[PDB]
Structure 1
Amino acid sequence: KAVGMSNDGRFLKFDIEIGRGSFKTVYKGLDTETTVEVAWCELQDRKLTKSERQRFKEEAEMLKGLQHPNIVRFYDSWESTVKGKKCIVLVTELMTSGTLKTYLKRFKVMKIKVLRSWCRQILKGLQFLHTRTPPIIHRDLKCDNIFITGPTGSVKIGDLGLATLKRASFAKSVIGTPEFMAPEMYEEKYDESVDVYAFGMCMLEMATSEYPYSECQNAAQIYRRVTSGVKPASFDKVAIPEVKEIIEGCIRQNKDERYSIKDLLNHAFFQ
């Protein structure tokens, strides 16, 4: 039943797989100190670069100290092996009710009251990160890493450390759904405003129930459109003018012209 544990006995791994990605497999686990189930994520160490492995360790140490209602709890991390696999284990608060991505798939639309409340919570989570000293920039905010505490619960932003694997400047294979990112992030030249861009694109997806830029077949075509100011076609499908305006001011090409988080939280839309 237990197929691993942390060196101090505090966390146990079950052989119950609950997510997967290029770099990770996620298992259900247990905090024996509290009795609460946790997520036990195994990062494939051999795929990482030296600088990524260094970064992950530094970021995991700052992560352990963070606490905010709209950020997924990060408990700890260490190096582990099992048979021929070395990994970095990360233990986080278990999220059982899906993500914004799963919500949209299942329920088809997000009603505006829900959009308003959950977007407000995402902005509080980001304001919290950006006001840490020094600021934490998420860098990889998306619908699939904004977790819900229940189908009518609150949202919590997750994967803050995993964002250090975003590999924004890498060549990548043309397979699966091509992705966009903020124009400056292609060159790795970010600040807080990259999270505003990403927030805007998340809101657009919430408002339209589609991933932006589906008209493009690959990430190069997306790159050409994003770095020349061309909006995703789904922008024109946002039915509510107020919601469309907010998106528009978040997803500006030039980072210095985007909304600030303060100005979003102060916007009429958000009380």
Structure 2
Amino acid sequence: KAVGMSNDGRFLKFDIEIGRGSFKTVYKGLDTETTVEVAWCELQDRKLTKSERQRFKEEAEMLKGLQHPNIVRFYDSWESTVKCIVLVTELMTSGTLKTYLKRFKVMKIKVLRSWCRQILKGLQFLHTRTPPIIHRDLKCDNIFITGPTGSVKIGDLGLATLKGTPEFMAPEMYAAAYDESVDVYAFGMCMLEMATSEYPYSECQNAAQIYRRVTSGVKPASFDKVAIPEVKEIIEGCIRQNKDERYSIKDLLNHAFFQEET
């Protein structure tokens, strides 16, 4: 029985917590138009500058237009008062990929191959939009498994973005202009985590140690533990220091490893 409702009446909320984050709580809900169960997410209240809420309002209109089989569906968003912002997405039945990896040690390469191809197809959708969407937070916790066939979808786009010149600019300003290639780097880290069932840069104690590492040529210790050389070679071409030397997503999907269907 419902404890909350959308203004249009389409979406119902049930008081059954299915996920928990530090600034967001995920409840089970229902789409009464399609009679499918949905995910009802309550996010912590945020500042209401007039220009910001017109931006959120219009960014959510774009998000609910993004229909693709390897992206978690965004249905609606509106403001409410449980004490906040309410978000309704597609319900992922089999949890996150990190949950699968936390349960087993050696993923089989048919699954490595199938699940990564879907992640790439989903990233390729985002990067060919107008303007393109850069996810910026691709990780195994933001990748979900759902349905009877075990379909793989990318979710949680909360940190994504769209798309004179200063004379005396500091080096951080010059390298600050990044592009979709940061998602290729992140994909390579996810594939590394799938092929090793180890967290990359586990040995480190902070993110400061992590940066100085990639820069001198020290890849995660888990990289030199990758069994299949074809997978290893895909990973290094994904996490290359210089972005202009990396795979594009299209070349990844043209790779012999992903052209196989097994």
> What is the TM-score of this pair, normalised by structure 2?
0.88
Quickly say closer, same or farther: Cα 1:32–1:127, change in 2 above 3 A: same
Question: Contact 2:126 / 2:133 at 8 angstroms: preserved in 1?
Answer: yes
Displacement of 1:144 after TM fit? 0.6
Displacement of 1:188 after TM fit? 5.3
Displacement of 1:224 after TM fit? 2.1
- The 5 A counterparts of 1:164-179 are none
Question: Contact 1:120 / 1:265 at 8 angstroms: preserved in 2?
Answer: yes
Question: Contact 2:134 / 2:180 at 8 angstroms: preserved in 1?
Answer: yes
Name the count of aligned residue pairs.
Answer: 258
CA distance in 2, matches of 1:11, 1:4: 8
CA distance in 2, matches of 1:143, 1:248: 18
Quickly say closer, same or farther: Cα 1:185–1:47, change in 2 above 3 A: farther
Gaps of at least 5 residues in structure 1 are: 166-175
Quickly say closer, same or farther: Cα 1:161–1:202, change in 2 above 3 A: same
Map Cα deviations across residues 220-249 of structure 1 (whole Å, 9 max, x no partner).
211222344421111111011000000000
Map Cα deviations across residues 27-56 of structure 1 (whole Å, 9 max, x no partner).
111111111110011110237998876654
Quickly say closer, same or farther: Cα 1:126–1:239, change in 2 above 3 A: same
Map Cα deviations across residues 46-94 of structure 1 (whole Å, 9 max, x no partner).
3799887665443321110111111111000001111xxx611110000
Map Cα deviations across residues 118-163 of structure 1 (whole Å, 9 max, x no partner).
1011111111111111111111111011111148512011112354
CA distance in 2, matches of 1:183, 1:117: 40
CA distance in 2, matches of 1:50, 1:190: 29
CA distance in 2, matches of 1:256, 1:208: 26
After the TM superposition, which of the residue ranges 8-17 and 41-50 deviates more from structure 2?
A: 41-50
After the TM superposition, which of the residue ranges 246-255 and 146-155 deviates more from structure 2?
A: 146-155
CA distance in 2, matches of 1:177, 1:150: 49
After the TM superposition, which of the residue ranges 67-76 and 214-223 deviates more from structure 2?
A: 214-223
Map Cα deviations across residues 190-247 of structure 1 (whole Å, 9 max, x no partner).
2110110010000000000011000011122112223444211111110110000000
Question: Contact 2:70 / 2:118 at 8 angstroms: preserved in 1?
Answer: yes
Q: Considering only aligned residues, what root-mean-square deviation do their CA atoms show, in Å? A: 5.6
Displacement of 1:257 after TM fit? 1.2
Question: Contact 2:105 / 2:196 at 8 angstroms: preserved in 1?
Answer: no
Partner SS state of residue 118, structure 2: helix
Displacement of 1:99 after TM fit? 1.6
Question: Contact 1:52 / 1:164 at 8 angstroms: preserved in 2?
Answer: no
Displacement of 1:255 after TM fit? 1.3
Alignment of 1:43 with 2:43, yes or no, is yes
CA distance in 2, matches of 1:37, 1:122: 24
CA distance in 1, matches of 2:245, 2:56: 31
- The 5 A counterparts of 1:89-108 are 89-108=86-105
Quickly say closer, same or farther: Cα 1:216–1:16, change in 2 above 3 A: same
Displacement of 1:180 after TM fit? 29
Question: What is the percentage of aligned positions where both structures have the same residue?
Answer: 99
CA distance in 1, matches of 2:168, 2:202: 10
Gaps of at least 5 residues in structure 2 are: none
Map Cα deviations across residues 156-190 of structure 1 (whole Å, 9 max, x no partner).
1111235469xxxxxxxxxx999999999997532
Question: Contact 2:134 / 2:161 at 8 angstroms: preserved in 1?
Answer: no
Question: Contact 1:100 / 1:148 at 8 angstroms: preserved in 2?
Answer: yes
Question: Contact 1:197 / 1:251 at 8 angstroms: preserved in 2?
Answer: yes
> What is the TM-score of this pair, normalised by structure 1?
0.85
CA distance in 2, matches of 1:218, 1:231: 15
Instruction: Determine the structure 2 residue equivalent to 1:71.
Output: 71
Instruction: Determine the structure 2 residue equivalent to 1:60.
Output: 60
